[PDB]
């Protein structure tokens with residue numbers, strides 16, 4: 145009833161079209177845009193969903209010669225005698241109103257996320273379920289996007305589980321550490337020679353210009369005492385950060401920091417990058433956090449007068465993350481696989497207790513948000 | 529001599545360290561920075577070049593308690609009785625002056641690059657020489673970065689060559705088209721029921737938020753008349769535009785256009801993204817171009833009043849690219865490999881002579897600029 149056309153006209157100048165639907169809603173469409181998106185086989189390929197029409201063959205000052213219509217189609221003719229047909233629902237979807245434009249975007253990028261601090265309820269799902277049923281994989285990825293972390297439980301106690309979640313999404317993000325990477329730790333109890341420390345909050349691989357979108361951490365076998373994992377919602381924190389200290393937020397969202405990483409793994413390497421600890425989009429919203437104090441280079445490209453104030457804003461930031469109001473604590477169990485957003489969440493670890501025995505085997509991997517995102521859309525279509 | 533300290537003092541407040549080299553230049557260093565990048569094993573992890581000192585342990589209001597020095601080192605004690613040693617040449621490198629910073633930056637990211645036009649002289653190198661000699665590999669990458677393109681010659685006539693180059697840089701960039709894709713065209717000698725148009729200028733894969741940085745194109749077999757390759761230097765162009773049409777430039781470098789791509793190759797997919805055709809850094813410098821009219825979505829999230837102006841401004845951009853002074857034409861031959869910057873150059877193809885035998889076979893691959901940059905950093909240190 146809203147996708148049905150009541151009145152369609154080319155207005156004045158013939159450079160714009162007005163569609164009035166049976167729900168008393170009006171839409172405006174630029175002729176030049178209509179010409180550029182003619183559904184005709186000569187201009188578009190339905191299969192590849194690509195446009196054949198060349199820009200060179202596009203009169204930016206084009207105007208509608210004439211048009212007729214019915215309830216679900218608009219017929220347009222142009223000066224060069226070119227013919228086009230547009231579907232009512234196709235137009236409606238692409239309405240230039242602020243609301244229609246906003247709605248379509250929501251439908252394309254799943255921008256809704258749920259903020260959280262220490263009151264977070266860690267989402268859970270079954271590893272094998274996510275593999276066999278799409279209803280679940282959809283629940284897995286859509287939750288990962290909204291919340292930023294999902295705990296898949298019930299995986300084997302051997303390597304190769306993250307690889308399976310890889311095929312499920314599409315493919316992992318190959319880095320200098322390889323396709324996957326195994327972490328292994330073993331310290332006998334009562335050993336006075338060793339000393340364990342905590343792990344300050346961070347995001348992985350900030351030494352790359354395009355950091356890994358999501359991380360996959362499978363816990364094969366783990367026997368520890370106080371190695372509780374900790375995590376904070378970078379977005380939530382940033383919001384609170386500017387609200388409680390604009391000066392800090394300013395500096396961190398505008399000062400470029402250099403990150404490096406040299407070594408040999410999948411090959412010899414030497415990476416460097418410049419990132420702003422708090423990256424914002426052109427509209428001022430936090431889109432990614434880039435921070436790993438261990439990889440922040442000793443080189444700092446900025447005038448001396450900026451240095452001290454910078455370290456101050458960083459301090460305030462790290463303190464805000466450590467406040468119990470921001471950090472969620474939990475513990476991984478053998479067979480579990482953690483999956484989170486590395487642009488959003490910052491993770492760390494508590495301090496292993498005393499001289500207690502510690503032994504763990506973990507397998508990790510990264511995935512790109514474009515791959516996950518693509519998978520999410522295909523999956524949302526299979527489930528709905 | 530420039531790395532030789534004549535005098536080093538902790539200016540009043542002890543929040544800054546002033547050093548005067550035997551060459552008469554004075555370098556300033558903030559106390560908090562020195563204390564943050566302490567070389568001591570307890571704070572820094574030399575072998576890994578990673579910081580092990582936590583931010584929580586860094587007093588942003590710290591000052592130097594006392595210090596002594598010789599011609600090649602500075603020794604500093606801190607209030608909390610911590611001890612530090614600094615290398616003079618190490619400090620000389622990280623000087624906060626404008627020049628030093630800009631200098632060290634150049635060493636890290638190879639910013640240099642020559643703009644070009646129709647008067648371009650295509651850099652060439654031998655395929656096998658690049659594979660065996662690091663000097664030729666350095667010449668290959670440095671030029672690629674600097675000029676935007678490099679033509680390797682001598683590759684075999686069988687697939688699997690662009691793979692050897694990948695293993696030479698580090699590793700290829702896997703996309704939805706596998707690790708490598710192939711193109712095989714074979715239109716018979718004088719076919720009447722078929723026509724071959726031209727390819728407009730474009731960059732590849734704008735549908736990804738992180739488009740492929742470098743493209744590798746191997747010409748395995750090509751038997752064609754006409755259809756010459758056409759490349760253009762986007763950076764040069766973008767600059768000429770800003771000069772001739774500040775409005776067009778302003779629009780293109782500030783409007784977010786949608787790009788889409790759905791299909792199946794390495795697996796099914798439905799990638800969607802938003803990009804400013806002319807991407808600028810935070811200093812107004814063009815750092816990347818994102819354009820492929822085919823994969824530019826029919827969806828356009830922008831207020832109607834901006835539509836026509838945008839279309840008008842793109843036509844400007846495209847017309848400038850097709851200008852006789854902006855494009856460089858060349859024809860690739862069998863056995864050679866074209867390697868170019870997919871973020872800078874835009875490529876197209878001329879129209880094949882009508883009714884002429886068309887027989888092609890090429891193998892392509894993508895690479896990430898960070899992987900290439902790493903190889904480039906590791907090679908410079910091996911040839912220089």
Ligand SMILES: O=C(N[C@@H](CSCc1ccccn1)C(=O)O)c1ncccc1O
Pocket residue numbers: 327343348349361373374482491492493
């Ligand atoms: O955070 C890192 N590793 C830590 C944590 S990985 C396990 C983990 C993952 C997510 C949340 C809490 N703990 C470790 O090995 O214990 C890490 N990140 C980047 C590079 C090297 C690392 O050890």
Ligand SMILES: O=C(N[C@@H](CSCc1ccccn1)C(=O)O)c1ncccc1O
Pocket residue numbers: 711727732733745757758759866875876877
């Ligand atoms: O530009 C594309 N292909 C064209 C050109 S690839 C050969 C080429 C590469 C670089 C410069 C000129 N020609 C073709 O197959 O003839 C292309 N790009 C992205 C997706 C599909 C394509 O066919």
Ligand code: NI
Pocket residue numbers: 346347348491
């Ligand atoms: Ni980590």
Ligand code: NI
Pocket residue numbers: 730731732875
């Ligand atoms: Ni192409």
Ligand SMILES: [Zn+2]
Pocket residue numbers: 182183184185186187188226227228
């Ligand atoms: Zn048409």
Ligand SMILES: [Zn+2]
Pocket residue numbers: 566567568569570571572610611612
């Ligand atoms: Zn120290």
